[PDB]
């Protein structure tokens, strides 16, 4: 990629944990406007949704989810990106939660008022991505709510993407390698506090391989750290060999790049996030 408007991060400790292959950390420059999105969605929730209470989304001590994942985000989509990813941890926290009147019709002024900003910014490609959006708006085998998704659409609207139809079959399935890697690595760095907050009242991989091999946690997490690294191995061998042909269209291209720093940033956010940190847990999170 052509780097732009992100900054490669030194992080020692990736090195020694060996969930990412060695893909480079690289951060957004913007890390201010991911903020500033961020503090705008809790505004927006809590005067049309909710009470916000223990909640910890994308944020973190030096970046942001979206900085370190989508780090070639265009700097002027950069507030509106982290905005609706926000708004997407918001979300699935209180659909978790729930699975009133005023809260829902809340959530669809916020939800509009989010796409006329996306419309003005780039009317295509939002077209693209709330497609894609729509759905959200025993063994680990058949563990696995298409959130490929939400995050394809936020790739390609965050980076001006357009993937031609006729690439769209083959880049989503090549683009699975890396989101099993990334999600693997996710429910690896969440079941302590998903446990905690189940414990005190879980669709986990750590949970599910405990189930399946009768094991304990830390059996289970060095199963499922085993699976991330045949994942991420996989990925980073099928987007060289893709660049190196240099077939593909530039776009899915740097789709398929992002998805490298996908899962290094993600994994960098895991170790230090507060939403997944015991330290700040609380009884009665809201949502
Ligand atoms: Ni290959």
Same mark, same amino acid.
């Given at each position: 990629?052509?780097?732009?408007?992100?900054?490669?991060?030194?992080?020692?400790?990736?090195?020694?944990?060996?969930?990412?292959?060695?893909?480079?950390?690289?951060?957004?420059?913007?890390?201010?406007?991911?903020?500033?999105?961020?503090?705008?969605?809790?505004?927006?929730?809590?005067?049309?949704?909710?009470?916000?209470?223990?909640?910890?989304?994308?944020?973190?001590?030096?970046?942001?989810?979206?900085?370190?994942?989508?780090?070639?985000?265009?700097?002027?989509?950069?507030?509106?990106?982290?905005?609706?990813?926000?708004?997407?941890?918001?979300?699935?926290?209180?659909?978790?939660?729930?699975?009133?009147?005023?809260?829902?019709? $809340?959530?669809?002024?916020?939800?509009?008022?989010?796409?006329?900003?996306?419309?003005?910014?780039?009317?295509?490609?939002?077209?693209?991505?709330?497609?894609?959006?729509?759905?959200?708006?025993?063994?680990?085998?058949?563990?696995?709510?298409? $959130?490929?998704?939400?995050?394809?659409?936020?790739?390609?609207?965050?980076?001006?993407?357009?993937?031609?139809?006729?690439?769209?079959?083959?880049?989503?399935?090549?683009?699975?390698?890396?989101?099993?890697?990334?999600?693997?690595?996710?429910?690896?760095?969440?079941?302590?506090?998903?446990?905690?907050?189940?414990?005190?009242?879980?669709?986990?991989?750590?949970?599910?391989?405990?189930?399946?091999?009768?094991?304990?946690?830390?059996?289970?997490?060095?199963?499922?750290?085993?699976?991330?690294?045949?994942?991420?191995?996989?990925?980073?061998?099928?987007?060289?060999?893709?660049?190196?042909?240099?077939?593909?269209?530039?776009?899915?291209?740097?789709?398929?790049?992002?998805?490298?720093?996908?899962?290094? $940033?993600?994994?960098?956010?895991?170790?230090?996030?507060?939403?997944?940190?015991?330290?700040?847990?609380?009884?009665?999170?809201?949502?």
């Amino acid at each position: 990629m052509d780097f732009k408007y992100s900054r490669e991060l030194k992080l020692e400790s990736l090195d020694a944990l060996n969930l990412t292959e060695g893909i480079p950390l690289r951060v957004n420059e913007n890390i201010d406007l991911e903020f500033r999105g961020i503090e705008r969605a809790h505004s927006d929730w809590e005067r049309y949704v909710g009470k916000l209470n223990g909640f910890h989304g994308g944020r973190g001590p030096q970046f942001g989810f979206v900085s370190a994942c989508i780090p070639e985000c265009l700097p002027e989509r950069m507030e509106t990106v982290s905005y609706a990813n926000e708004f997407a941890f918001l979300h699935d926290d209180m659909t978790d939660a729930a699975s009133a009147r005023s809260s829902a019709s $809340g959530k669809q002024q916020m939800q509009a008022k989010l796409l006329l900003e996306m419309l003005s910014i780039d009317r295509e490609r939002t077209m693209v991505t709330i497609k894609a959006w729509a759905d959200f708006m025993d063994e680990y085998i058949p563990y696995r709510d298409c $959130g490929e998704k939400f995050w394809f659409g936020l790739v390609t609207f965050a980076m001006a993407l357009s993937i031609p139809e006729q690439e769209l079959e083959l880049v989503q399935r090549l683009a699975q390698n890396a989101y099993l890697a990334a999600g693997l690595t996710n429910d690896l760095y969440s079941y302590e506090k998903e446990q905690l907050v189940a414990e005190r009242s879980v669709f986990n991989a750590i949970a599910v391989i405990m189930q399946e091999h009768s094991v304990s946690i830390s059996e289970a997490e060095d199963i499922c750290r085993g699976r991330i690294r045949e994942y991420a191995a996989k990925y980073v061998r099928d987007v060289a060999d893709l660049r190196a042909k240099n077939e593909l269209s530039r776009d899915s291209l740097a789709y398929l790049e992002t998805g490298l720093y996908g899962i290094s $940033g993600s994994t960098a956010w895991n170790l230090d996030c507060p939403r997944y940190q015991v330290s700040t847990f609380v009884d009665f999170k809201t949502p």
